[PDB]
Each structure stands twice: as C-alpha cells, then as structure tokens.
C-alpha cells in the first residue's frame, strides 16, 4: 500500500487572516510541543511505507500531524482558532484509536496532550 498524499496545507481559495489566537498557536502552543523530547514521532505524517505499518490508513482517515499543523499556520490556513485545535485533537486521538492503551507512543501523545490543554487555557484574548 502507498502513503496517502498528506493533508492540504496551503488554499489560495480560503480567506486569510492573522489573529491574536492563531499566531499564539504558531509562537507559543505549537513551537512549545514540537521542542518536546517526545513530539518528533508527531513532527511528519505517519510514513506507513517507511515504518511497514500496512494497517494504519486502513483505519486512520483523518491523519494529522504536527508538521502539517505548522505549514496551515504559517500558511494561513486557518480562519478560526479551533480549526487548529480541532487538528491537535485529531492526532492525539488517532493515536488513540490505533494504538492499544499504554503503549509507548500512546503515552507520548499523552504527555504531549496534557502540555497542550495546558497551553491552550493561556489563550489570548480574542479580537
Ligand atoms: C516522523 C514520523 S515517521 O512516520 O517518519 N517516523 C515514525 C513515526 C512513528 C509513529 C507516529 N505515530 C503517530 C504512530 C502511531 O500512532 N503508531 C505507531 C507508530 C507511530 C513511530 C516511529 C517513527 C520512527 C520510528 N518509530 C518507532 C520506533 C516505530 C513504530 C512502529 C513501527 C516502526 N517504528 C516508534 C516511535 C515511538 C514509539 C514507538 N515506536
């Protein structure tokens, strides 16, 4: 089986702007969990090919991952903030759909989960 394409990260069909929230998404929230120790797993989309991972686009349809995130930022890909949480959420709970709880990548998510919400209820005021 082939890698899927990954997720669109640039329409110059969409509307395009920058906000307090989404570029506090880019600057605090994103480039805070890509430093982690545990967030380069998450950095690329899952390389099924690479990996031999012959099940996970059998399961997983809504890929996401935090590279992806960063261009759609830099891009202005997002309109709203909770279109760019709606993503982090997505990843996390991929890994969570795929992988049987506790096992090692399932506790990374978590740990970056957890650092996520926490940055996430620093949210600047909103125009
Ligand atoms: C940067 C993305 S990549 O695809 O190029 N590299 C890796 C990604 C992923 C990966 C990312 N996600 C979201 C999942 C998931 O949900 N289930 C299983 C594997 C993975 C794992 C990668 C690796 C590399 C080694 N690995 C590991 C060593 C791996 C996992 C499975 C098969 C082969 N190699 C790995 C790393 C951490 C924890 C456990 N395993």
Not at 17 to 29: A, G, S, W
Not at 47 to 68: F, Q, R, S
Not at 107 to 125: C, G, R, S, V, Y
Request: charged share 25%.
């Amino acid at each position: 089986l082939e890698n899927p394409p990954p997720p669109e990260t640039s329409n110059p069909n969409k509307p395009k702007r920058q906000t307090n929230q989404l570029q506090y998404l880019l600057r605090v929230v994103l480039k805070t969990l890509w430093k982690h120790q545990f967030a380069w797993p998450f950095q690329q989309p899952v390389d099924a090919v690479k990996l031999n991972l012959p099940d996970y686009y059998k399961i997983i349809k809504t890929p996401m991952d935090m590279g992806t995130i960063k261009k759609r930022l830099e891009n202005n890909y997002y309109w709203n903030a909770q279109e760019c949480i709606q993503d982090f959420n997505t990843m996390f709970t991929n890994c969570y759909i795929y992988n049987k709880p506790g096992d090692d990548i399932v506790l990374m998510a978590e740990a970056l989960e957890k650092l996520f919400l926490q940055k996430i209820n620093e949210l600047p005021t909103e125009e």
